Amino acid sequence: KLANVVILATGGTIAGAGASAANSATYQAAKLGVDKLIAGVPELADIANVRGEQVMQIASESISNDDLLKLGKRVAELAESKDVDGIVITHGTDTLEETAFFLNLVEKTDKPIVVVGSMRPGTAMSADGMLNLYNAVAVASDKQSRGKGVLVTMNDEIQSGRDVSKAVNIKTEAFKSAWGPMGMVVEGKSYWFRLPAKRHTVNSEFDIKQISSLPQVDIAYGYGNVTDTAYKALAQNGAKALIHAGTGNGSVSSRVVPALQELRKNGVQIIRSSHVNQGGFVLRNAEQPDDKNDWVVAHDLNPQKARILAMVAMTKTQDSKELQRIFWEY
Amino acid sequence: KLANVVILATGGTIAGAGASAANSATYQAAKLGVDKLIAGVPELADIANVRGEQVMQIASESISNDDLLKLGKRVAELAESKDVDGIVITHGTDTLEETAFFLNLVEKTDKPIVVVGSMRPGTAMSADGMLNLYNAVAVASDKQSRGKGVLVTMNDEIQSGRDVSKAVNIKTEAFKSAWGPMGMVVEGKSYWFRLPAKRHTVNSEFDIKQISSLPQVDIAYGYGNVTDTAYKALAQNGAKALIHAGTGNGSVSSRVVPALQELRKNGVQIIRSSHVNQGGFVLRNAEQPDDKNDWVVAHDLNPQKARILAMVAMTKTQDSKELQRIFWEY
Amino acid sequence: KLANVVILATGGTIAGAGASAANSATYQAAKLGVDKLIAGVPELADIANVRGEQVMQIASESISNDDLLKLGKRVAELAESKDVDGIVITHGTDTLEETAFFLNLVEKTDKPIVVVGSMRPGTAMSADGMLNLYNAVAVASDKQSRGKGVLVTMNDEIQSGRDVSKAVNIKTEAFKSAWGPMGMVVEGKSYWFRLPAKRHTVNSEFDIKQISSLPQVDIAYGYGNVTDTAYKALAQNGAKALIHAGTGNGSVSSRVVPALQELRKNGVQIIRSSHVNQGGFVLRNAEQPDDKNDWVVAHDLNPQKARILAMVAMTKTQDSKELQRIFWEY
C-alpha cells in the first residue's frame, strides 16, 4: 500500500520556464500549476499516491509573512488529516531555507514535511527539478523520515530544514549546511548518517495553531564604515527585533553600539548574527557585552534564519534571556 | 642579502589579549604595539630585515574610509621607497577582506603586499598569529609574490586579497575563496598552483595617489518580507550607491523594485550582490532587467567587497555601463 | 567536583619535536612522554583530574593490529573502572581515523572516549596540540559526550570517530567528515548540532573483550591499466578480505573481475570501497553484480575504514549477507 503524499505548490523556478533549453539561469518563475508539475513526473505513481494543491504562485524572493502563515496553517490542516502520510512543498530556492526553518519550528507533527525547489527551470537542458520532486516524494513517503523535522531534498541530499542554506549560486549543489547533510536519497531510497540534535516539530514549544500574527523583524548589514542609519530607520518603521548581520563573530561597530543600546532600551530586541555563514557560531559576551546590554546572539543561525526564529519566539516572549535559550535550543 | 619588509600594524586580534590561555575566542583586540608583535616572533630576523610602524590601533569592525585611505597612502609611500621590498599589514579579521581588496585595486606596485590577522589572540593556547605573521613576512620577501596582487597568508594558505572572505567563525581556517587558494606557505617556502585572472595593482586603472576621499556606499539586506525602508534611509543619509545583498541570484522583492527604480532615476547606483557567498555569481539581466533599469550586478563579489569596488570605481565614473565593466574586470 | 580523565598516549606528532620553531611540517614524532604532554597544558587542572599512561610510543603510520588490540584492551579496562569518567587517547594523525573507528565498534561503554592529535609538533610556532588536548579533556569530561560514540576533537570541532578522516595535508583543519562535524568545542564548552545515526559502543554487537587477534585484511588500489597482481599477492600472503579501493562507485576493471571472482570462490571476502572519499557512497549491484558474485559494498566508508570494519565483522561472521548488513548499520 502506497503512502498518501500531498504536494503544496508555492511557485519558484521548479514551476518556471525559460525561452530555450540552454536557459538554465534566465527564466520566469511560478508559471506551471501543481497538476502540471505532478504530471511532469509520471514515475511518482510508482512511489506514492500524490495529489497537489496550489497554495500560492510566487517568486520566493517576494514571499510575505502572510504567505508563511497561510502555508503553515494549510500544512497543519493536512498533517492533522488521517488521509495524509507526508507533505511536500514546492518552493522558489531564494527563501526556501526561511520557509523550511519556519515550518520546522511551528508544525507539531512527526509526519514527514519536505521542502524542494530547483536551480534550473523544467524547460532547461538537464533540469534538476524532476529528480528533486521525485526524491522529495520518496522521502515524504519513507518511515525513516518520521520525527526527523522538516527536510530539504535537493542534489540527492537529505538536509535539515533548520540549518540548510542557499550557499552557492547557479549550481544544483546550491543548498549546504555547516553541519553536513543528514543523509542521501538515491533511486527512491533514503540513507541516513546523522540525526538532528536541535528542537523541532513535535518537541517545539511553538505551534502554528496558536499563531495568527507574526512580529515584524528586520535585518541590517555590518561592514566597514557602517552607520546606525539602517538600524534606526528599520525600528522607526515597525521592527520589533533587529537582526545584526555583523562582520566576524557578530561584531558591532563603535558607530552603531550607541544606537543599539538606545533601541534595546526602547524595547527593540537586538540579535547578533553574522555574514560569516560557512561555519562556526556567534559566542555570547565575546565581541559585545550581551549581558550588560540585554542583547541576544544568534548562535550558528545566519541572518535570515535568525529573523525566522526571532519572529516565532516573539509570539510567546520578549524576555531576552528566554530568547537566548531559544537561540541555543532551536 | 635579506629582503627589507615593513610591517604596518593596524590592530586586531593578532595584537589582542585574553584573561587566560584558554581564552581563544573572548579577548580584547588592538592591545599590543608593533615592536612587541615583532619581538614575539624572533625567527622573523632569519627570513627578512623587518621594521614596524603603528599606522592605527583599531578593532577592524570599526574601520572607517578615513582609516582605509590613511593605510592606502602609507602603503603607496613605502611601495615607492627603494629601501622597501615587501609590505605586511597586521589587521583584525572582521574587515581584513575589505582592506585587502581595497589595496588590490588602488596600489599600483608589483611589490608584495600581504594582509594578515589571527583568529585567536597571541595570549591564547595554540594561537595562530605567530606562524601567520612569519608566513606573511616569508611571502612578502619572496620573488614569487611580485606581481600577484595583494595576498592573505592565514592557515598556511596564499589567498588572493580580491576574493578571499571571512567565511568560518572561530576556526583558524576562517578565510576562504570560492576560487580556491592560489598557493600554500610551509616552512617559509611558497608553493603556487594558480594565478590571478582579474585586474589588480600595476594593471589597475585606479590609483590611491589621486583619491582624496571615497564616495559613501551602503549595503541593505534582502530576505522574506523585506521592505524598501533601509534602501530609502541609506540614500536619504548620503549613499551614492546601494549594494543590495539579495536572496539567490541578486533577487529583488517586488516590494523593493519600485524604490530602487526611483533611487536610480535620482542618481543612486544600484548594485545587485547576494548573501549566497560560497560559489557562483550574480548574472546580469537574469533575476531583474538591469539594462532597462540601468542597474549593475556585482558578479561573484560579496556585498562588502562590492561596496569597496563601487567606492573606488565611482572616483572615475558615474556611467552604469562603465561600472558594470569594472565589476566584470576586477 | 571534576571528572577523572585518563590520557592514554600512543605517540604521534602531538608528542613530536622539530629542530626549530619554524619546523611545523619537518619533525620527529613520538619523542615526549605523556607526563610532559600533560605538564605542557597546566590549564588541564581547571577542567579535570587528569592522569597519563604511556601505552606505546609510535609514529602512527607504523601501527600494527597488535598495537590496536593493546590500546583497545586498555581502553576497556579503564572504561570498566568506577574511578574513570572519561578517556583521551593522544595519537599520530596518519591512522587516528582507523583507531577512532576501531574503538567506536568494539568498546561497549557510554563513557566518553576522545582521540586527538596535532598537525604541528609542540615545538612549532602556533602548535595546535595544546588546545587540541585541552579540548579533548574538556569533551571527555562533559556529560554531553556520554553515549555519543568515539569523538575526535581537533580544529575546535567534535567529529564522529566513525567517519572523520584525514582529508587535508599540512593544515590544522586536516580532519573532515562527509556528514559534517557533530559539534564544536570553544573555551572548554561543547556545542552540539547533530547526533550519530549509526551503531556504536553500547549498541554494537562487537566487544573487544572477546577478540584475541584480528583477521588479516589488506587494501588494493584501482586505476587505469590496473591488473589483478596486488589482489592475488595479498591473498597469497594471508588476506582473509580484500578492500578494493576502486575508481568511482567501487568500479572494477574487466582485467580484475575474474581474479576477484576466483578469490571469493576460494573464501576471500571482496569489499568494494573507493578513492572517491569527499562524499557519496558505493551502491550495491550498481557497478558490479554483488549478489551474483557474493561481494560486499563498503557504503560510505573509505578503504582504511572499510578494512577496520571488515576485521571486526569477520570476528563474528563469514556470511557475506551479514557482512553487508554490518556495512549498512555501522
Place this chain on the structure above:
Amino acid sequence: KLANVVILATGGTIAGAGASAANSATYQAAKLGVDKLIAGVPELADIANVRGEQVMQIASESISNDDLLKLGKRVAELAESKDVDGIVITHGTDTLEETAFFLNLVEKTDKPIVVVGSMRPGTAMSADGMLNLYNAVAVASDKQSRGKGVLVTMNDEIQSGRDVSKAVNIKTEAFKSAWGPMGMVVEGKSYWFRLPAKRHTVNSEFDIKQISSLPQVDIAYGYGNVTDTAYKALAQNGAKALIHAGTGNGSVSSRVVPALQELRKNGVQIIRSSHVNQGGFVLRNAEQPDDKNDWVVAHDLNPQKARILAMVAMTKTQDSKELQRIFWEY
C-alpha cells in the same frame, strides 16, 4: 562564423542507459554511439559546427595505456588540422581525471581540449550529460579557452584537467580541485577567475608525437598493519615505478621502508603520494629521507594522477632528481 569542434567519444555514463527514468545510479555505460549523443543535443548547432568520431566504446574503469595512446595520438592529429578549432572528449567519469591530466602533459597545442562526462545516464530523470556536453562544446569553441590547458566542464564549472579529481560519488558535483574551479560556464558563456600556474600543453617538455610506449607504473596503498607484499608483487610483475598512496604526508610504515629501499636499488622509482586528497601536498624530506633513499614526492598529486605524470616523465628520464623537478613543475 562558428568554431569547428570535433567530439571524440570513448564511452562512459554520458553514453549510458538505465532500465527506468529513476535509474540515476544503476545503468549500463558506453551504449550510445557518438552520432546519437550529438543528435540528443540539437542546440550544439547554435554554438558550433560539430562532428563526432567513435574512438573507443569503454567503461573508463577498464581503460588501458594502449587506449590512452590511441586517444592521445588522435587528438594530436586533429589539433594539427587547420579545419579543427577545438576538441571535446566524451569519457566515463571513473578515470576522466587520468585522461585529462595525460592529455594536459602530452598535447603540445593551444587549441582547446575539453574532457566531459556525466554522473547520471542520459535516460535518467534530470540527466546532467546534455548540459555538460553543450558546455564542453561552448568552452571548446571559446577564444578564452586557448592556451589554458586541458579543461573539464561539469557542474557549470571550468576545472583544470591537471588537478580536478572525482571526489564525490553519486552527485553531479563529483569533480573537485583542491585549488578551486578556474571558471564557470553559464548559458554558453565562459567566466574566468583563475589561470593555471603549472606547465602544460604548449609549454610541456613532453609530446605525444614522440611517445609510442608508456612505462608500466602501479599503485600500492598505505594503511595500519600494511606490509611490503603489494609493492614487491607489483615490481615482480613489471612496475618501473611504484606510487605509494601513503597515510598523511606520504608516510611509509617501518615494515615497508626496507622493501622500498631494496626496490629503489633494483631501479624501481618510489613516488610518495597520499590518500589525503582534499588539500595540502606531500613535502620532500619531511616524513621520509627522500634525498638519502633517492625517492620522489608527488607534491599535491593524488596517486592516480601521480601514476600518469610518472609514466609520461619516465619516457624521458630515470634520474630521480629530474623526476622530482617534473613533480614540482607539472
